Amino acid sequence: VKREHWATRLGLILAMAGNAVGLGNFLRFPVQAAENGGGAFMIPYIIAFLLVGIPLMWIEWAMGRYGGAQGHGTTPAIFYLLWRNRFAKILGVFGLWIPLVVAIYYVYIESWTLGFAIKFLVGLVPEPPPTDPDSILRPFKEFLYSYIGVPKGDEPILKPSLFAYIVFLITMFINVSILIRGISKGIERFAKIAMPTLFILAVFLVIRVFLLETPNGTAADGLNFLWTPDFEKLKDPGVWIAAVGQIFFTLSLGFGAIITYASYVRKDQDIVLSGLTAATLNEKAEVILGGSISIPAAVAFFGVANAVAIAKAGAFNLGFITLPAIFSQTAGGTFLGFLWFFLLFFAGLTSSIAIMQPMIAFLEDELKLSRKHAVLWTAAIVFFSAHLVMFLNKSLDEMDFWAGTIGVVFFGLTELIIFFWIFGADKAWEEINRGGIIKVPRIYYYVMRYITPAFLAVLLVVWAREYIPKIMEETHWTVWITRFYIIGLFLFLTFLVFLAERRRNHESAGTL
Ligand SMILES: CN(C)CCCN1c2ccccc2CCc2ccc(Cl)cc21
Ligand SMILES: CN(C)CCCN1c2ccccc2CCc2ccc(Cl)cc21
Ligand SMILES: CCCCCCCCO[C@@H]1O[C@H](CO)[C@@H](O)[C@H](O)[C@H]1O
Ligand SMILES: CCCCCCCCO[C@@H]1O[C@H](CO)[C@@H](O)[C@H](O)[C@H]1O
Ligand SMILES: CCCCCCCCO[C@@H]1O[C@H](CO)[C@@H](O)[C@H](O)[C@H]1O
Ligand SMILES: CCCCCCCCO[C@@H]1O[C@H](CO)[C@@H](O)[C@H](O)[C@H]1O
Ligand SMILES: CCCCCCCCO[C@@H]1O[C@H](CO)[C@@H](O)[C@H](O)[C@H]1O
Ligand SMILES: CC(C)C[C@H](N)C(=O)O
Ligand code: NA
Ligand code: NA
């Protein structure tokens, strides 16, 4: 062919919206917000969306469409197209490494939601007794802990239940069944089914939650806590780092995923309005839907102070333990739990296929593998690698940090510098607006060229100076097992880019 292309504009928008709308909206956002003072988190969040989220979204859509027009959907080649320096290809490897590493733990978490959905649907759930908080949360904590196999001793090892393992296998098979059908007949087709389902399930859950009321509060108290400003924290670096990190994660920015999806957009197609729409749809799903489910429910039943303590407790407690526990105290609560996990599963699935496609696109575009082989090998690498996340306690956290937290911010800055500084601000601006149904507001030219990069640069330095040291000095030794492995993955991916180069050289000397 030349390239596969999104069939319809609606399919394109829903596929991109599904790329973005995932576990980050319903699980990550609530914890981050509650953990950072709720309303106090929102100001930096909104600012990050305007100064970082929106501008980078347009930039990645532009880079992808630009690359696609020349038959390239991933950063190793696209970065090179924008800056013909071998170093561009190496920096580009992060556009394959980040999504791959994130997929290695993201699909596993996604599989938990399918496993929970299954168990809640058939009623194989814990039975709490008769209004102490712990006698109520404990059965659900044990339920999660037995599912993933949390360490009961001193060894930093996890023991996933057999059901969890088999469900991960099924989950991988489901991701493959969609990806193996390609862009239009696979990802786009699925998005047209999943997004509407996702929206309906989420609205229903918000409505149900809004009816919650106990001696400790109502869902309204939850919304008040999340949407009430606290200008006295606008000066804490930590809240800003959390806010910006969430924006990157929730919009799928810096993962090379938006770029790859955009590489299937026809060269002439608009990306300004489409990009803004995908981004806007994600924010609504995040702040309106995701923000209105778990926090209001937790606050209604336990009050703000306890809700916050829950979010800070961590380990998927809010979404996999607390919410289902709360639901169990209501009529039809087990089924509500099913709907919650089913919602999470579809949110995750539409996002995981998005972070596996970069590796698939690279194998197809640069190594010329058939889609079938590219999808199967990608799945094999993710499946194999995930065993590290399934059996080594904290490996998931380590990957989520280096690739999904630090990595994306670093890559976002990198792609911006390459596209807006090296490739050329005016050429980049031109490329972004080309074919647009609407033009990017002019003030954004200055935001992209000066504000965004300066913003990310400062964030990254603050990170390396007052946070990375603790992570490098105060963690259990087992973190090095994961660091070693993912560094190895980077090395391997660089080797593949080298092979792509050599294949390119040999076909050019065969093109003459
Ligand atoms: C009414 N049916 C069209 C929906 C079931 C098909 N579907 C689907 C839809 C569009 C494009 C690819 C795929 C692949 C198979 C698959 C796998 C899992 C799920 Cl959760 C849905 C699903
Ligand atoms: C601290 N870890 C136990 C958890 C890290 C995983 N993670 C994550 C990663 C992918 C998808 C959903 C979620 C939900 C939980 C959550 C909450 C806050 C943060 Cl900042 C990360 C985070
Ligand atoms: C292909 C790479 C394989 C690495 C070793 C994988 C071992 C998986 O082993 C399986 O794990 C499940 C969940 O913990 C258990 O329920 C099964 O009984 C066990 O056989
Ligand atoms: C979606 C269907 C998943 C079926 C796998 C369920 C695994 C849950 O549990 C396992 O089931 C096995 C066979 O029933 C038993 O031999 C194991 O002892 C038991 O732990
Ligand atoms: C870095 C990833 C390494 C994965 C190696 C997994 C080896 C699996 O090991 C197996 O796990 C089962 C369930 O936990 C146990 O029941 C078996 O006794 C054990 O041998
Ligand atoms: C990241 C690696 C996680 C590994 C989890 C391993 C759980 C293994 O289980 C252990 O395997 C050993 C060797 O087979 C046996 O000698 C032990 O008796 C057994 O408990
Ligand atoms: C920090 C980023 C803020 C983005 C808000 C942009 C609001 C758009 O602002 C509008 O842009 C148009 C096109 O440039 C101008 O013609 C209008 O006069 C201006 O009000
Ligand atoms: C890594 C990304 C695909 C994650 C997705 N944007 C989410 O919010 O879950
Ligand atoms: Na999102
Ligand atoms: Na999604």
Side-chain angles (χ1 to χ4, degrees), residues 2-126 128-153 155-512:
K2 252 233 173 42
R3 210 173 185 59
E4 251 214 87
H5 293 296
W6 301 100
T8 63
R9 185 135 218 99
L10 174 63
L12 164 62
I13 300 300
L14 296 184
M16 284 282 198
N19 179 320
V21 181
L23 304 182
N25 302 59
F26 301 103
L27 295 182
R28 212 185 181 89
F29 175 74
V31 172
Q32 300 292 278
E35 202 165 57
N36 292 288
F41 174 77
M42 297 308 285
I43 294 299
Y45 181 82
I46 295 174
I47 290 175
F49 176 62
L50 297 172
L51 298 175
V52 178
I54 292 178
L56 279 186
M57 180 64 78
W58 281 319
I59 286 171
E60 285 192 34
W61 275 73
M63 292 179 72
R65 180 180 63 161
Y66 181 77
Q70 305 191 209
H72 299 289
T74 61
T75 51
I78 295 181
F79 275 12
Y80 186 65
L81 288 176
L82 299 177
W83 177 38
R84 285 155 220 283
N85 187 290
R86 208 166 140 271
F87 195 58
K89 295 176 186 177
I90 301 173
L91 286 173
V93 173
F94 281 105
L96 297 185
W97 182 80
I98 293 176
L100 182 67
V101 172
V102 171
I104 290 164
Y105 70 82
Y106 195 96
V107 178
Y108 184 45
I109 297 172
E110 176 184 309
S111 74
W112 305 351
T113 68
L114 176 57
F116 272 56
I118 292 175
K119 299 200 71 178
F120 274 71
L121 174 62
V122 314
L124 296 175
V125 300
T131 107
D132 143 23
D134 287 3
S135 68
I136 254 159
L137 291 168
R138 195 181 303 113
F140 285 92
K141 169 147 295 185
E142 306 181 322
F143 185 82
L144 171 64
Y145 283 30
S146 299
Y147 185 90
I148 65 180
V150 174
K152 295 181 296 295
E155 298 180 309
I157 300 305
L158 295 169
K159 209 81 53 181
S161 69
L162 178 59
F163 179 60
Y165 192 77
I166 293 169
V167 169
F168 177 59
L169 278 165
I170 294 170
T171 299
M172 283 303 312
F173 173 79
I174 291 172
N175 273 264
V176 167
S177 72
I178 294 168
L179 290 165
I180 204 161
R181 292 194 211 284
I183 304 305
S184 67
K185 295 189 171 186
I187 301 178
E188 184 176 358
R189 192 132 305 187
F190 184 69
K192 289 186 168 185
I193 298 170
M195 298 316 286
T197 297
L198 192 165
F199 173 68
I200 295 173
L201 286 172
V203 171
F204 181 74
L205 284 167
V206 171
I207 296 172
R208 182 72 195 77
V209 168
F210 275 16
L211 293 172
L212 293 179
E213 156 157 38
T214 79
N216 293 307
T218 70
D221 295 317
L223 296 181
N224 291 325
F225 164 71
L226 187 73
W227 296 98
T228 301
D230 185 308
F231 305 107
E232 288 181 53
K233 211 144 190 174
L234 294 177
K235 266 69 111 183
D236 176 356
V239 177
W240 283 88
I241 289 180
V244 177
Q246 178 60 33
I247 285 297
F248 263 94
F249 194 89
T250 199
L251 287 171
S252 302
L253 301 171
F255 295 88
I258 291 296
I259 291 179
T260 294
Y261 265 35
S263 78
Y264 298 110
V265 174
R266 287 179 185 293
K267 171 177 105 299
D268 58 300
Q269 271 185 278
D270 154 273
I271 57 175
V272 184
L273 182 61
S274 290
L276 179 61
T277 299
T280 295
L281 285 175
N282 179 74
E283 294 311 298
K284 289 176 180 177
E286 176 135 313
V287 306
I288 304 173
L289 303 183
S292 299
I293 295 175
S294 64
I295 294 300
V299 174
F301 269 64
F302 304 110
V304 181
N306 278 303
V308 172
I310 288 174
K312 292 181 179 178
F316 305 94
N317 191 124
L318 184 55
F320 287 92
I321 297 178
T322 298
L323 196 62
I326 290 174
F327 286 172
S328 77
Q329 298 300 102
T330 65
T334 300
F335 190 74
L336 255 314
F338 159 68
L339 296 177
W340 164 240
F341 292 114
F342 192 74
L343 166 65
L344 296 179
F345 178 58
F346 261 26
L349 181 54
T350 51
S351 287
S352 56
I353 55 185
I355 47 181
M356 270 169 78
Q357 183 63 203
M359 184 62 180
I360 290 164
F362 170 79
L363 294 177
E364 299 172 323
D365 302 341
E366 321 305 330
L367 292 188
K368 305 305 180 182
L369 305 198
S370 63
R371 180 173 64 225
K372 177 183 182 178
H373 292 163
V375 171
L376 291 181
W377 275 110
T378 294
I381 293 173
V382 172
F383 175 67
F384 171 75
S385 299
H387 285 71
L388 186 54
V389 173
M390 298 189 280
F391 291 97
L392 189 63
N393 194 48
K394 301 317 172 185
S395 178
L396 182 155
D397 304 57
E398 199 60 29
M399 294 189 195
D400 180 72
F401 176 71
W402 295 110
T405 309
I406 300 299
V408 300
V409 178
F410 164 74
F411 199 58
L413 176 57
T414 295
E415 64 189 8
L416 190 158
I417 288 169
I418 291 187
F419 190 55
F420 240 72
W421 286 8
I422 302 180
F423 179 65
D426 302 309
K427 243 157 66 181
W429 183 256
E430 169 105 61
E431 186 55 32
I432 295 173
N433 286 292
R434 189 176 58 66
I437 295 170
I438 59 176
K439 286 192 174 182
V440 176
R442 188 146 167 153
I443 187 60
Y444 267 117
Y445 169 91
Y446 298 97
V447 173
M448 295 178 171
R449 188 169 180 174
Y450 305 107
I451 305 300
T452 306
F455 188 74
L456 299 184
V458 179
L459 208 83
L460 284 178
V461 187
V462 177
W463 223 328
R465 291 183 175 176
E466 268 105 86
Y467 297 110
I468 293 180
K470 221 191 142 64
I471 295 172
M472 291 293 244
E473 255 218 14
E474 294 293 333
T475 47
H476 187 73
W477 70 263
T478 52
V479 297
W480 283 106
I481 298 169
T482 298
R483 295 175 183 173
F484 169 76
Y485 188 70
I486 61 181
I487 287 173
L489 286 176
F490 188 93
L491 233 302
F492 159 69
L493 289 168
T494 299
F495 182 59
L496 292 195
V497 169
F498 170 83
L499 295 182
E501 287 180 317
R502 297 304 166 291
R503 185 205 65 70
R504 182 171 84 273
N505 291 169
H506 304 181
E507 41 130 321
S508 283
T511 311
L512 296 197

